[PDB]
Design an enzyme around this catalytic site. Structure first.
Site, PDB file in Angstrom:
ATOM      1  N   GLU A 146       1.241  10.490  -2.242  1.00  0.00           N
ATOM      2  CA  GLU A 146       1.451  11.886  -1.860  1.00  0.00           C
ATOM      3  C   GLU A 146       0.193  12.517  -1.267  1.00  0.00           C
ATOM      4  OE1 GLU A 146       4.076  13.588  -1.542  1.00  0.00           O
ATOM      5  OE2 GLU A 146       5.600  12.570  -2.744  1.00  0.00           O
ATOM      6  N   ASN A 189       5.738  21.666   6.214  1.00  0.00           N
ATOM      7  CA  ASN A 189       7.033  21.076   6.538  1.00  0.00           C
ATOM      8  C   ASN A 189       7.758  21.861   7.617  1.00  0.00           C
ATOM      9  OD1 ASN A 189       7.042  19.022   4.259  1.00  0.00           O
ATOM     10  ND2 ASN A 189       6.912  20.935   3.099  1.00  0.00           N
ATOM     11  N   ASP A 220      10.650  23.296   7.580  1.00  0.00           N
ATOM     12  CA  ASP A 220      11.312  24.515   7.115  1.00  0.00           C
ATOM     13  C   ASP A 220      10.353  25.693   6.916  1.00  0.00           C
ATOM     14  OD1 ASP A 220      10.072  23.816   4.743  1.00  0.00           O
ATOM     15  OD2 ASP A 220      11.919  23.498   3.609  1.00  0.00           O
ATOM     16  N   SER A 280       7.840  25.712   4.705  1.00  0.00           N
ATOM     17  CA  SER A 280       7.187  25.593   3.413  1.00  0.00           C
ATOM     18  C   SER A 280       5.989  24.657   3.539  1.00  0.00           C
ATOM     19  CB  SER A 280       8.156  25.059   2.358  1.00  0.00           C
ATOM     20  OG  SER A 280       8.507  23.715   2.635  1.00  0.00           O
ATOM     21  N   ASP A 314       3.413  21.834   1.183  1.00  0.00           N
ATOM     22  CA  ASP A 314       3.193  21.047  -0.030  1.00  0.00           C
ATOM     23  C   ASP A 314       1.713  21.103  -0.405  1.00  0.00           C
ATOM     24  OD1 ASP A 314       5.869  20.274   0.018  1.00  0.00           O
ATOM     25  OD2 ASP A 314       5.445  18.460   1.178  1.00  0.00           O
ATOM     26  N   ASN A 338       5.880  21.803  -3.654  1.00  0.00           N
ATOM     27  CA  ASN A 338       6.403  22.560  -2.519  1.00  0.00           C
ATOM     28  C   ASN A 338       6.529  24.060  -2.764  1.00  0.00           C
ATOM     29  OD1 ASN A 338       9.115  23.508  -0.889  1.00  0.00           O
ATOM     30  ND2 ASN A 338       7.849  22.073   0.289  1.00  0.00           N
ATOM     31  N   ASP A 378      13.888  18.743 -14.004  1.00  0.00           N
ATOM     32  CA  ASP A 378      14.881  19.580 -13.328  1.00  0.00           C
ATOM     33  C   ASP A 378      16.204  18.879 -13.029  1.00  0.00           C
ATOM     34  OD1 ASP A 378      15.198  22.297 -12.594  1.00  0.00           O
ATOM     35  OD2 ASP A 378      15.139  21.743 -10.469  1.00  0.00           O
TER      36      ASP A 378
END
Ligand code: CL
Ligand code: CL
EC number: 3.2.1.17
Length: 129
Positions: free
Chosen positions: A35, A46, A48, A50, A52, A59, A101
């Site tokens: 990562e 990203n 969209d 957003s 990281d 995110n 989650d």
């Protein structure tokens, strides 16, 4: 900060990640390697809109607030900048929420594509743990 492999493994163990939700320490070290290359300051934007953040690339749409991701939920209740610290506490605490989650470590694309189903124990081999 750029961590060494064993240094990170030890830090993650101290913060209770070893076997957290059934994921052995090697899984977490492998995820961090792919990562962020063990760099706490890593950021990636990203499509969209957003971003990281940090060693585990958490995110901004769901987990932290960076002030520029509209409709962000901030589920870890922290500024995204806190995830870039040399102290990995904030990243670990938020990661524990993410992995709980429902989808486990599949939330991390690099883990799914590069760690899942491999000999992840190799990532902690040779380390004084
Ligand atoms: Cl392991
Ligand atoms: Cl799971």
């Amino acid at each position: 900060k750029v961590f060494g492999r064993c240094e990170l493994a030890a830090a993650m163990k101290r913060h209770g990640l070893d076997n957290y939700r059934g994921y052995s320490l090697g899984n977490w070290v492998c995820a961090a390697k792919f990562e962020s290359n063990f760099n706490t300051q890593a950021t990636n934007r990203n499509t969209d809109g957003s971003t990281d953040y940090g060693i585990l690339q958490i995110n901004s749409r769901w987990w932290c607030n960076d002030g520029r991701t509209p409709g962000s939920r901030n589920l870890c209740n922290i500024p995204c900048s806190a995830l870039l610290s040399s102290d990995i506490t904030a990243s670990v605490n938020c990661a524990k929420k993410i992995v709980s989650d429902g989808n486990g470590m599949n939330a991390w694309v690099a883990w799914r594509n590069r760690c899942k189903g491999t000999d992840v124990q190799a990532w902690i081999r040779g380390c004084r743990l």
